[PDB]
Amino acid sequence: AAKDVKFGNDARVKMLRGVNVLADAVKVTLGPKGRNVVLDKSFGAPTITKDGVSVAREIELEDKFENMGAQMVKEVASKANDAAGDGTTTATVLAQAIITEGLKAVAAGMNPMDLKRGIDKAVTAAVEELKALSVPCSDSKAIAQVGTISANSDETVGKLIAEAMDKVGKEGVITVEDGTGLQDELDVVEGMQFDRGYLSPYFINKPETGAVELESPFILLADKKISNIREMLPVLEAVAKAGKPLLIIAEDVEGEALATLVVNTMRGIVKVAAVKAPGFGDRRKAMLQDIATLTGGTVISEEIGMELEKATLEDLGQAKRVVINKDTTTIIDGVGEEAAIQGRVAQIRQQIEEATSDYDREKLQERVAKLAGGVAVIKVGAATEVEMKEKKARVEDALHATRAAVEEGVVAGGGVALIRVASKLADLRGQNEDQNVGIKVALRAMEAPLRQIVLNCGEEPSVVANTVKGGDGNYGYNAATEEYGNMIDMGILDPTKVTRSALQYAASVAGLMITTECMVTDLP
Amino acid sequence: AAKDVKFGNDARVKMLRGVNVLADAVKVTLGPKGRNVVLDKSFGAPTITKDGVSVAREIELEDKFENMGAQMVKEVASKANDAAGDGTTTATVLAQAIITEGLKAVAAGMNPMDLKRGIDKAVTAAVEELKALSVPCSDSKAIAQVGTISANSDETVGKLIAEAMDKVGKEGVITVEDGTGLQDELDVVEGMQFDRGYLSPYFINKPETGAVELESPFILLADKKISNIREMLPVLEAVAKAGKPLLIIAEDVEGEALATLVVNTMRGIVKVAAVKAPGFGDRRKAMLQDIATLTGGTVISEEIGMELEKATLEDLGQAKRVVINKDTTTIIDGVGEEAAIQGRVAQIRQQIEEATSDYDREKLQERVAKLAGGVAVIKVGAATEVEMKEKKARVEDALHATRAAVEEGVVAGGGVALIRVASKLADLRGQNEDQNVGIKVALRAMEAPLRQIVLNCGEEPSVVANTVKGGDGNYGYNAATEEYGNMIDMGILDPTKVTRSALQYAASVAGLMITTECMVTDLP
Amino acid sequence: AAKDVKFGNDARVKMLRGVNVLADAVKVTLGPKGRNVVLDKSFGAPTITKDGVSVAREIELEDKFENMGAQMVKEVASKANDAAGDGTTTATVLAQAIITEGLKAVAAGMNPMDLKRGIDKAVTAAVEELKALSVPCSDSKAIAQVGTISANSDETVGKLIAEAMDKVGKEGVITVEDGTGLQDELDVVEGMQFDRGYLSPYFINKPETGAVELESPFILLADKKISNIREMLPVLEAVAKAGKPLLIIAEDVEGEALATLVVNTMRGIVKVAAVKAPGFGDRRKAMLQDIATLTGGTVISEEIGMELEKATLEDLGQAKRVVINKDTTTIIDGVGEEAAIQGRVAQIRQQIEEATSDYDREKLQERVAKLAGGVAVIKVGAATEVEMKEKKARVEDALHATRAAVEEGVVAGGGVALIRVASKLADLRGQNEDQNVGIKVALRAMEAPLRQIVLNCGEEPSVVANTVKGGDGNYGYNAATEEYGNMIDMGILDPTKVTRSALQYAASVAGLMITTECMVTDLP
Ligand SMILES: Nc1ncnc2c1ncn2[C@@H]1O[C@H](COP(=O)(O)OP(=O)(O)O)[C@@H](O)[C@H]1O
Ligand SMILES: Nc1ncnc2c1ncn2[C@@H]1O[C@H](COP(=O)(O)OP(=O)(O)O)[C@@H](O)[C@H]1O
Ligand SMILES: Nc1ncnc2c1ncn2[C@@H]1O[C@H](COP(=O)(O)OP(=O)(O)O)[C@@H](O)[C@H]1O
Ligand code: BEF
Ligand code: BEF
Ligand code: BEF
Ligand SMILES: [K+]
Ligand SMILES: [K+]
Ligand SMILES: [K+]
Ligand SMILES: [Mg+2]
Ligand SMILES: [Mg+2]
Ligand SMILES: [Mg+2]
C-alpha cells in the first residue's frame, strides 16, 4: 500500500523516542534493587517477570517509527539471550547509551560511518582487554557465588546448583522442572536410564514397590519387533541352562509372544522381562547401539544380515542389576569395555562439534551424559503458580550463568570490569577526528550499567561512579550493603562471556542504528 | 471504475513530484559518505540497506499520479540491478536529472519528440566515447581495488574476492552464504562434488571423521532402479577378482541389495559404497553423463539398450580417490581423457549460449565450473542478523562489480568518466534547434553523479565540478580524503559496463517520460 | 433498479460532454507532433502509448449519461482498429466533429432523420470519390514510405518491413516478437517448418549445433500411433538396404519403439529420426496431407483402409535436407510436383474465401505461406520494457498500414484527400432543406483531421486549411518540416482503405447518435 517517508532529524527523533520507551520499560529490572514488571497475557493470568528479554519481547508502540526503533532494539536482547542466556538488561542499557551519545554526536555534524568505525575499533580493543582481565573459575565456592549472584542474591539456589554440578561431574545434563512441594528438590540419576517400562504387569517379582528387579541378567538387543515365538526358542533354551535372568529390549512385543514369557516366569522356569527401545527412527538405533556398547553386547538387526535364530550367548550383554518400574527402567554397572565407551563418547563429541542446531546439540549432550556421566533434575517449589514461574526463571538464569562461568571465567561484577576496561583504553586513537569521537562515545557509554544500578538503588550515580573510578583493581560498590570494598571478597562475580557478548551485540546493533538517515513505513 | 484525466502542466508537475519523492528517497545512499536507509517489513524486524534498488522497490505514494511517476522511475533502478548488478543509484540520479531538464525545456515550447531524438543521439555518442575510454583490467591488484571500491571502501572483502577469483580461475562460480563466526572466511573445493551422502551408515571405514574414503576405486554409473542384486552379481564378481574397490551411483537402492552390500563390506571381501543420483530428470541424466565422461566410464541405461548384468570392467570408470561424508560425495583426479572433457565443456557452453533466463544460466555455469575449474563459497560473519544482511549485500555488490570489470574493463571512478565523455561531445549537433536543446540537456545531466557525491560529502558541488572539469585525463576528486589527484593512482575504479548500462537505461526511460501529455487513472 | 430519465437538451448536453471528454483524451496523439498518453495499470507499471484505440478503451466517466456518450463513441475506434488496424484517431476526430455539427443543427430546429439521411448520402458519394482518387502502390519505395509514415516517421522500420515483404513474397506471414538486443532484427524462414522437435535426445549426431542433420532422407508419414515394432520391420528393412536416412512423423511413438531405433542409430545400421505430428484434429490431418504433397509421398492412414506393413519405397517422400532441433523441424527443398502444389494452394485459397471468421483464416494463410512462400519474424529491440511495448505497437501499425496499402492503394496523406473529396462534392443536393443541411454538415466535418494536425503542430489551422483548399491535386502541408509542397513528392502516403473505413464508421455512429431524444440509465 501507500508509504510514509521522513528524512533526517524527524526520523532520528522518532526512532530515539521509540528506543527510549523500550529501554525505560526494560532497564528498571537491573541490579539487586530492581523491581518486577507485569506482562498481560490473553491466555491466562498476567505474569510477573524480572527478565530483560521477557519484558523486551512484548513492547510494541502505536507509532510506526517508534515501532521501528523498538523492533530494531529488541534484537540486542534476543541475541544476548540466545547466545549466553543471561545479561540482556545490561546489553539493552549499553545499546541505549551508545545510541543516545551517537545521535548527539551526529547532530553536531560528524560522519556517521566514521563514528561506527571508531565504535567498532573500541569494542574490538575492549573484548581483548576483557579476555586479559578474566580469571579462571574452578572451585565450587566460586560456582556457588556465581549462582547466588545470578539468582537475585539467593544463597540456596547457588548452593543447590553447585552441589548438582559436583554430583553430576564436568560432563552432564542439569535441567529444571516445576515441583509439587514448598521447597526445592534435587535428584540425580547415576547410570543409564530411559523412560520405557515393562510391557506386562505380571513380570513383577516384588509388589512391595511395584518394580521388576533382576540380578546379573542377560541383555538381548533386537531392532525388529517380536511377532512369533519362533525366533525366541534357541536363546531362551540356552539361557535356561544357565539360570541367569534375561531382559528383552525390542521395538515391540505382541500379546501372544509375551504370553509365553509371562507363563514361563510364573512356572519358575526362566525369569524374563520385556521393555521397548527408546526413541524413533535412527535415534532409536543410536540408543540401542549405545546400550550394546555399554553392556558389552551386540545388537541383532535384520538390516546388517544376521538373524535372531542365529543368536548365541556371545550376542547377549551383561549387567549387575536391572530395575524396571511402571514408567522407567535402569541398567547399573554395565560390563562393557571402557575403550569402546571412550570411542563412542569421542565420536559423538565430534558429531556435536559439527552440529549447529540447538535441539540436536541438546539431544546429543543428553546422550553423552546418559552413556557416561550423569543426569540431574532440579525441582523448584512454590505455593503459587506465578511464584513458581518466577522462581523457575531465576533458577534457569542461575544455571546458565554458572555454565558460562565454568566455560570461560569470572570478572568483577557490578559494572566494574567495563569501567576498568574503559579506563585502560584512554590512549586509543583512530584515523581522523570522527573515529576518535566514536571511540570516546563507546568509552563513555561503557559506564552505563553501574550508573543505572546505583540509580536503581537510590543514590547519586555520578559520585559513586567517580569514586569507583578513583580506585584500582577490584574496588567497587556493593549495592546490597551500600558500602565499598573488594568485589571478589564480597562474592559478586560476573562471567566474562556474558559481559563480552552483551558489549559486542549492543555495539553491533547501535553502530547500524546511528547511521540511519530516512525511514519508510506504511501509512497510519 | 471511473477514471480521472489530467492534461498538460498539471500531469507534468504531478509526475515530477512523484519522481522527486522517489529520487530523494533513493539518492541519500550515493558515494562513500552516503547514509543507510531503514525499510519497514511487516514480517520480522526492519531491514537497513544502502542499495538503491532495494530502497526504490518499496517506495509507493498515495496520490495516483505521483505514484505513476514513481513507477516510471523505479524501472530504471530495476533494470540497472538486473543487468549489471551494480550502479542503480547513479542510474536513478541520471534519470531524475534528465527528466528535470527535459520538462524544463518542454515548458519553454520545444517539441518533446525532437528532444527525445537529441537525447538518444547524445547517449549513442557517449556510449562509443566510453567504450573508447576504457582500459583493460586483468591483474589481481586492480580486481582488489574494484572490489574494495564497490563494497563501501572495505579492503578485506575486496582482497578476499580477488584471491578467491585467483584460486578458482577463469571458469568458475563464486557464491556467498550466511556464516556463523565473527570473521570472514572463504571455502574452496577443487574437482567434482555433489550433495549426496552414503546410503547406509555401515559403509564407514574411518569413523574418526564419520566418513568413508576409497583408494583408487571403480565407479559404476547406472540409470536403472536397483532393487535386486542379480544384475550386480557379474560386476561384483569382476571387481572382487580385480581387487580394486567399487562405487555405485544409482537412482536408489532398496534394503535387499543394501544388506548384501554391507555384509560383503564388513566381511572384508569387497569394498563398496552406494550413493543416490544427484539432480532430478534431464539435469540428473546430464550430470551423470558428465561424471561418466570425467571418470572415463559409460552410463548404463535401460532405455539405451544395455543391461547392468552385461556390464564389464570397461564400463566402470576410475578415479584416484573418493570421499563420501554424511551429506556430500567427492571425486578427485579422474581418469577421463582431456579432449572429451573439452568437447563436453564446449557443448555445455553452447547450450549456455541459448539460455533464455538466469535460472538455467546459473545452473549451467555451475555445471561448467564443476566439469573444469572450481567452486568457492564465501561465508560472511557478523554478530547480529541486520549486520549480516548488510554485509552480505555489500559482498554481493563487490562480486558483481568485479565480474563486470573482468568482463569489459574499468574507467576512472567518482563520476569523472561521464564528465570527460560529456566534455568530449561539446561539438555534437542535430537537425533542428530542439534536437540541439535535447543534446545539451543530456550533456548537462551527465554531471549529476559527481555533484550528488560532493553534496553528500558536505561540500559545494559547484566548485568541485568546476575544478574537475578544468583538469585533464583522470584528474578527479577523492571524496573520502577530500583531495584532488589522479584517480587511477588513488585506486578508485568503476567498470565501464556499469556506467554504460546506467546511462542507457536512464536515458531510455527519461526520453519516453518527458513526452507525456495526459494521464488517466482510477478515481480515489 | 430505479432508473433516471432525461429528455431533450439535457440528455444531448450530457452526451456531448462525454463525447468531448473522450475525444479530447484521444486526439492529443494525432500527427507527427502528437505526444504520448500514459495509462494506469493496476497490475504492474503503467504503459506509455500513442494509439487512439488504446487510449479510448480505458476512458469511462463517473456520470452515467456522459459515460454512455463515451461508450457509444468508443465503438468508432474499436471498429476502425478491428477492420483496418490503423486510422482510429482520425475516425474519432471525424465522429466528434460530425456529432458537434449535427447537434448544433438539431438545436437549430432541423429534423434529425433527414440530417442522418443527408450524412449517409454525402458519405456514400465520398467513398466513390476516394475510390476514384486512389492510385496503385506496388513498388518497394512506396511500401517503405508508407511504413515510415505509419510508424511515426521512422525510416529503419519502414525499410525493414519493405525488405521483409520483398523477401517473403506476395502471400506470406510476417509477425512481430520481443527481441533481446538493442537493434531491430529480421528473421526469415525458407522452406517448410513446423513447431515440433525430436522425441529422444539420443538421435543427435552434431553436438556443434545440438541438432540432427540428415542428408537426402526418406520421409515416412503415419497417421496412427506407433506402439509396436512389428509393423516397422518391412519399411525399416527396405530403407536399410538403400542406405539413405529416414524420418518418421506420427501422432506419438512409445519409448519401446524408440529403444530399437536409438540402438540402430548408435550401431550405424540405419540413420532414423522420429518427430510428432504437428497440430491436433482435422487440421493435423490436412497439413500432414500437405506435408505428403510437398514431399511427394502418400499418407499411411488407417482411416483410408491402407496398412503400414504393406508400405514400400514408393510411399516414402524425399527432401534435400532435414534439420530437427529441441523445438523445431525444417524440411529443405522437398521433392515434389509443382502442379500438385499449385492445385493444393488453389484448394486452400478457395477454402479461404469461404472463411467467415478472422481466427479461422490466419491459420489458412499460414498454411498457404508454408506450402508456397515463407514466413518472417521481426524482432524489436529496446533497452526497457516500456520502450519495447511502444516500438512493437508502432511496428505493428506500420505492418498493417503496408498490408492495406498493398491491398487497395494509396492517397495523398496529411488529411488532404478528404479535403479534395469534400471540394468535389460541393454541388451535392438532397430531397429537402434538412438533407442539404446534413450534407453540408458532413462536407464541413470532413476537414477536421488536417485542422487537428496543424493545431497539434502549434500553428493556426484556419490559414493552413485555407491555403491547402486553394490548391489542386496533391498539394498539401508537410507537418514535420512546416512547408507546403507536393504530398506524393515528399512521401506522405496514406492507404485508401484506412481513410474509407474511418470515414464510414465515424459517419455511421455519429448519424445514429444525432437522432437521440431521451436517455434512461440507473440512478447514482
Ligand atoms: N550486591 C551487588 N552489588 C553490586 N552489584 C550487583 C550486586 N548483585 C548484582 N549486581 C550486578 O547487577 C547485575 C544484575 O543484572 P540482572 O538484573 O541479572 O540483569 P541481566 O543479568 O539480564 O543483565 C549484575 O551484572 C551484577 O554485576
Ligand atoms: N573514495 C571515493 N572518492 C570519490 N568517489 C567515490 C569514492 N568511492 C566511491 N566513489 C564513487 O561513488 C559511487 C558509489 O555508488 P554507490 O553508492 O555504491 O551506488 P551504486 O554503486 O549503486 O551506483 C561510485 O560510482 C564511485 O565512482
Ligand atoms: N510529415 C507529415 N506531414 C503531414 N501529415 C502527416 C505527416 N505524417 C503523418 N501525417 C498524417 O497524420 C496522420 C497520423 O495519424 P496517427 O497519429 O498515426 O493516428 P492514426 O494513424 O491512428 O489515425 C496520418 O493520417 C497522416 O496522414
Ligand atoms: F537481565 Be538478564 F536476564 F539477567
Ligand atoms: F547503488 Be548500487 F546498488 F551500488
Ligand atoms: F492511432 Be492509430 F492506431 F494510428
Ligand atoms: K534483569
Ligand atoms: K549505494
Ligand atoms: K495515434
Ligand atoms: Mg541476570
Ligand atoms: Mg555499488
Ligand atoms: Mg497511426
From Swiss-Prot, chains A, B, C:
It holds the Pfam family Cpn60_TCP1. Keywords: Acetylation, ATP-binding, Chaperone, Cytoplasm, Isomerase, Nucleotide-binding. One of its GO terms (cellular component) is membrane. It comes from the Bacteria. Changing D397A: Can bind ATP with normal affinity, but is defective in ATPase activity. Binds non-native rhodanese, but cannot release the protein. InterPro entries: Chaperonin_Cpn60_CS (IPR018370), Cpn60/GroEL (IPR001844), Cpn60/GroEL/TCP-1 (IPR002423), GroEL-like_apical_dom_sf (IPR027409), GROEL-like_equatorial_sf (IPR027413), TCP-1-like_intermed_sf (IPR027410). GO terms for molecular function: ATP binding; ATP hydrolysis activity; ATP-dependent protein folding chaperone; identical protein binding; isomerase activity; magnesium ion binding; unfolded protein binding. GO terms for biological process: chaperone cofactor-dependent protein refolding; protein folding; protein refolding; response to heat; response to radiation; virion assembly. It catalyses: ATP + H2O + a folded polypeptide = ADP + phosphate + an unfolded polypeptide. ATP binds at residues 29-32, 50, 86-90, 414, 478-480, 494. The lineage of its organism: Bacteria, Pseudomonadati, Pseudomonadota, Gammaproteobacteria, Enterobacterales. It is found in: Cytoplasm. During the substrate-folding cycle, the two GroEL rings separate for effective substrate binding and chaperonin activity. Ring separation is triggered by ATP binding to the trans ring of the asymmetric GroEL:GroES complex and avoids formation of functionally impaired symmetric GroEL:GroES2 complexes. Activity of the GroEL-GroES chaperonin complex requires Mg-ATP. UMPylation of the chaperone by SelO/YdiU negatively regulates its activity, and may facilitate survival under stress conditions. Its EC number is 5.6.1.7. Belongs to the chaperonin (HSP60) family. The keyword DNA damage does not apply. Forms a cylinder of 14 subunits composed of two heptameric rings stacked back-to-back. Interacts with the co-chaperonin GroES. Can form asymmetrical complexes, composed of one GroEL and one GroES, and symmetrical complexes, formed between one GroEL and two GroES oligomers. The asymmetrical complex is the functional unit. It was suggested that the symmetric heterooligomer may represent a transient intermediate in the chaperonin protein folding cycle. The modification N6-succinyllysine is found at K33, K50, K116, K276, K320, K389. Together with its co-chaperonin GroES, plays an essential role in assisting protein folding. The GroEL-GroES system forms a nano-cage that allows encapsulation of the non-native substrate proteins and provides a physical environment optimized to promote and accelerate protein folding, probably by preventing aggregation and by entropically destabilizing folding intermediates. Also plays a role in coupling between replication of the F plasmid and cell division of the cell. Each subunit is composed of an apical domain that binds non-folded proteins and GroES, an intermediate domain and an equatorial domain that binds ATP and is involved in inter-ring interactions. Forms a large central channel that appears to traverse the entire length of the cylinder with no obstruction. The central channel of GroEL functions as two cavities, one in each ring, that are separated from each other by the crystallographically disordered 23-amino-acid C-terminal segments of the seven subunits. The entry and exit of polypeptide seem to be restricted to the apical end of each ring. This is Chaperonin GroEL. SUPFAM superfamilies: GroEL apical domain-like, GroEL equatorial domain-like, GroEL-intermediate domain like. Phosphorylated reversibly during heat shock. The modification N6-acetyllysine is found at K116.
